Design a protein around this ligand. Structure first.
Ligand code: SF4
Ligand code: SF4
Ligand code: SF4
Lengths: 630, 628
């Protein structure tokens, strides 16, 4: 009663209906967990071998100080942080690997085609793949094979994108964190955290750092570019967000998860004449496709597919009683959805052999016959409309307009508007660099990440975003933070005069954009690395020299720890709104929040007060601006 | 309540107390009652919504984690990350050996010592050998081995001794292995919040991952080590702490990777370093090994074995170790603090395993022998700092025989081959005694030490109970070094402890009743031996009277080992309970349903006398089912 469950009204309406229905939510289980383990919470519990469990004092000089094998608190903490990075990298690795495999199976008349040939041709140059006088699918398969070798090559060097500054690469080499193959780095961390291996906090964190780079500049980067090649590069597009996008008289099919091939094929199947007529024959007005979380962002960026909600609204979407099919693939799918859906007519469908869930309907997605497979899954959801009980349906009359589709290419297209045809060239990030250098924009910040019941859901996202724009810091968003901004109304051109400071409101008016730009899913944080890297190269500096920052105000996942680590290792200061489990390791805290700056020019900041985080980001950018002389 | 059954160990445990230094046994006692949640496997820390803990008792207390994960979901994921971690330790080990095979050369530090084996292994990888330079074949084979760690398209290469029935069974079950590092990433991905929440699907993913260790990572490591360093053959050595010499420079190799220990063995015979040892006042250089790096150089050179996992601190407490050179895995970080109470130089050599307050001397794999010589010289010069008044080396050591590769076992079995009836160079004589019942079965006793078990007591009790019941025993790792210290690795142990059938086979074949087949990656030699017998009898490995036992296991590598031994069709007994009691479905999958999937299952038995009765009854069940 001192603290609300959420700032969103639709969410609070469906939290009351969930209580009345006698169903359980993530908030209830959070409360049932009561006081969470102080050892685990400080990172000082170890279970890396059956001599354990071990727990050491999170207060140095008192209590039990070493694990049975001899591991100190700093060793136990730093190995635990490293497995979070390895696990997060593994989630993005398999995401990207699946996309590179889909690129390898493309064909002229097949279900998966090349929609951006110009983007394929430029990506090919980065992989030294010839394009002159060749069939577009021969180039596609060559590029897929070269991308696949980044996951498992054992000899030679990995391929990294051209926007990554040479200064940053040299810095990584001298530090010993230059990335090797994606899966090879994940195995390296899992090996070194084994009992009787690494027992040195600095060496362990540097291993984590190296691993995390295989995510941001490889697995996530390739996943975004390859997705663009096959499904199209995003451009500005309108959509609507929040649970009010569900329709009582239509068939509501909610896509949840992260992999783009499935939801791209379900979007195509939704326009199939037979399934369109089927929807009419079951008594509906048509098919209403909605997305949640990253797959939702993915199809919303490319097709304007309505966004039903973010991470902690997934159960509440089912509580509306209007979801006929909930089609999921992998990552961030609460297993509670299987039990919750037993209280409604909703068919909870699992499609990935990487993520089976007991008591869910398994309908394996056949990546060899994608559209036929998506048609079969969609048909089950349509037929389920007949089992709806309209008397128990409750869709809050709350939704918001939102603008998104801000790829690096689209941001550059919009900047061309303020370019003088004579003085300068078109199609560059120079107009953005010009406002940052002049001080019309103080800086640029990325607000990313999940929800976490430790924070009033969406409160820290909105208060952080709003304060950074008020202070003339242009903001770019991805993931559930971007959906929190969408639902609230920050992704609108009108938000500029309503919330932004003087410089950012003026730039918005001139460039005709909102003050917050939705750049996509969590793999699409790679677009932000790309944008910052292009600006760095244009000003002939490293990324750590620029007034930029990253913020993860309500993070939860191991992916978010891999993201935070690769943003900092790449030279961008990162603020965490949820403390990672490290307080019990004084040397780890000092490495992350201090010595790190001496290694990569950036460091972590842990701040659970969004108002104080904004003050710290603004002061940090002002120090970097002075050091850079702007 | 005894800390150990070994006298030399107990002598040094008294000197450790008198010196005021702590040991693994003291830190075990300081840990008091270990967490019940973590012990039952019902704590979860896979995301920052946690820590979560659920009731290990169904129907009582908190039943789901904040994301909705049940106890079976939390337990199965935690077990799977142990396998993935255990696979990653053997993966990097093997990957490093394949990279060393790729860098071999006629006049370089690393050569091809077994050309015949290279040419046979090259055949398994579809690498041409006729009319080719041995180093071109070597490099092709190394590249084909390396692609088993990371290939994204195509199929992996598996050994010829793996029966077609077993491969077929894995395909239909959905656990046929993919690339080693691809599978480790698959388990880490599927255990991430909001992915797999199904116990059977998660254990099957762990089973699939473990096979990339036992039949790929470890198997390649062992074969490639044989190629470059020579296949083991019968050899004598001495075991236990009494192998240390007060008047020599004692250099103890501890860790797992064979290249460094091979290079230190070569460096120890360098005339300059031999003369340097005499100039600092020593009789010479006394090389000893501990744990798996010890098992590797002992199997190939007869290098003396100072001790096993829980003896590593006690070797330093002797006050006689001038240099303790280590690479990776099972190296207790307490060795850095412990060494500071003596003159010992605790040298870390691998960037994969840095240890705070240790002396880091990076092993240069581009100049292996020069690098080894520099490291060894430091240890020799440190003899000048010895304090002979603090030295106490127990007058306790044992003779041991080892070097039982599959090739050497076959060479010994030729002694009981009838020139007319049958062919030589096959496992048929072993299959014949198993079928006749002169040998009831064959068991592998493997694994670590764990302070939850009186050190070495469960290893010895298990092995003795099995050889007494005519079950021939094969050993690796710290279980093999427990047997070495005790005196079971001797031809004389047959009359003392073996049953009548096994005693006869031992007299005829001229072998001890307990066969040391190497290090932990050399468990792949056991898979290879069992698979060859299966194929010779035209059956699957689950049809044979064989078993695996890890009486005092501790590491994530042992969980990976147990999982691929069971997935390969060999029943496995565990002497230390894994963290699964809180997941009823997981316990049913591991100790029951598993048998329906792969023809073998886990058995959890902390009483070695009960484990021997169960293994014997189980083999008699399988013998009856097979009709022998
Ligand atoms: S790794 Fe070391 S601290 Fe960890 S559970 Fe094993 S003995 Fe304990
Ligand atoms: S195993 Fe560890 S983190 Fe988990 S509840 Fe127990 S002490 Fe706390
Ligand atoms: S994964 Fe589920 S059970 Fe594990 S800590 Fe995160 S919320 Fe809790």
């Amino acid at each position: 009663e001192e603290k609300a469950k959420s700032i969103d009204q639709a969410t609070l309406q469906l939290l009351d209906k969930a209580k009345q229905d006698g169903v359980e939510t993530v908030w209830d289980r959070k409360a049932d967990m009561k006081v969470q383990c102080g050892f685990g919470s400080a990172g000082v519990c170890c279970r890396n071998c059956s001599m354990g469990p071990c727990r050491v004092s999170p207060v140095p000089g008192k209590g039990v100080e070493r694990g049975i094998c001899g591991a100190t608190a700093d060793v136990i903490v730093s190995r635990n942080f490293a497995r979070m990075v390895a696990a997060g990298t593994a989630a993005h690795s398999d995401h990207g690997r699946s996309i590179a495999l889909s690129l390898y199976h493309t064909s002229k008349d097949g279900d998966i085609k090349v929609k951006d040939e110009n983007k394929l041709k430029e990506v090919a140059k980065s992989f030294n793949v010839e394009t002159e006088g060749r069939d577009i699918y021969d180039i596609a398969h060559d590029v897929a094979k070269e991308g696949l070798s980044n996951y498992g090559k054992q000899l030679g060097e990995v391929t990294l994108p051209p926007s990554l500054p040479e200064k940053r690469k040299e810095l990584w080499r001298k530090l010993g964190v230059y990335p090797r193959a994606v899966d090879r780095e994940i195995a390296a961390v899992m090996h070194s955290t084994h009992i009787g291996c690494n027992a040195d906090a600095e060496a362990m964190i540097k291993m984590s750092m190296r691993c995390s780079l295989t995510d941001g500049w490889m697995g996530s980067f390739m996943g975004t570019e390859f997705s663009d090649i096959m499904f199209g590069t995003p451009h500005s597009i309108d959509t609507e967000a929040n649970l009010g996008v569900l329709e009582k008289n239509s068939v509501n099919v909610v896509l949840h998860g992260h992999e783009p091939l499935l939801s791209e094929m379900v979007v195509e199947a939704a326009s199939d004449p037979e399934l369109v007529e089927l929807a009419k024959s079951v008594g509906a007005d048509g098919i209403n496709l909605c997305g949640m979380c990253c797959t939702g962002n993915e199809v919303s960026m490319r097709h304007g597919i309505k966004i039903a909600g973010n991470f902690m609204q997934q159960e509440l979407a089912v509580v509306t009683g209007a979801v006929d099919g909930l089609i999921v693939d992998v990552q961030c799918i609460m297993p509670a959805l299987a039990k919750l859906s037993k209280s409604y007519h909703t068919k909870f469908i699992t499609t990935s052999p990487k993520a089976h869930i007991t008591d869910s309907i398994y309908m394996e997605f056949d990546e060899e016959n994608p559209l036929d497979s998506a048609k079969k899954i969609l048909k089950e959801a349509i037929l389920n409309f007949k089992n709806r009980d309209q008397s128990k349906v409750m869709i809050p009359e709350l939704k918001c307009k939102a603008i998104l589709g801000y790829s690096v290419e689209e941001i550059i297209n919009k900047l061309d508007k303020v370019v003088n045809t004579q003085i300068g060239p078109m199609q560059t990030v120079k107009p953005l660099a010009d406002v940052l250098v002049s001080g019309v924009l103080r800086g640029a910040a990325a607000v990313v990440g999940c929800n976490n019941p430790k924070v009033v859901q969406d409160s820290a996202h909105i208060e952080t975003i709003k304060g950074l724009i008020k202070n003339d810091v242009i903001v770019v968003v991805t993931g559930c933070a971007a959906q929190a901004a969408a639902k609230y109304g920050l992704l609108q051109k009108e938000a500029a005069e309503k919330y932004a400071g003087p410089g950012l409101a003026t730039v918005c008016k001139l460039v005709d954009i909102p003050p917050v730009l939705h750049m996509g899913s969590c793999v699409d944080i790679s677009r932000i690395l790309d944008l910052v890297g292009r600006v760095a190269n244009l000003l002939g500096v490293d990324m750590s020299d620029l007034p930029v920052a990253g913020v993860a105000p309500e993070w939860m996942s191991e992916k978010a720890v891999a993201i935070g680590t690769y943003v900092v290792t790449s030279g961008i200061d990162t603020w965490l709104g949820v403390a990672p489990p490290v307080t019990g390791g004084p040397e780890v805290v000092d490495i992350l929040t201090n010595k790190m700056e001496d290694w990569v020019g950036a460091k972590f900041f842990i701040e659970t007060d969004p108002h104080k985080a904004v003050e710290q980001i603004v002061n940090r950018m002002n120090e970097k601006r002075k050091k850079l002389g702007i």
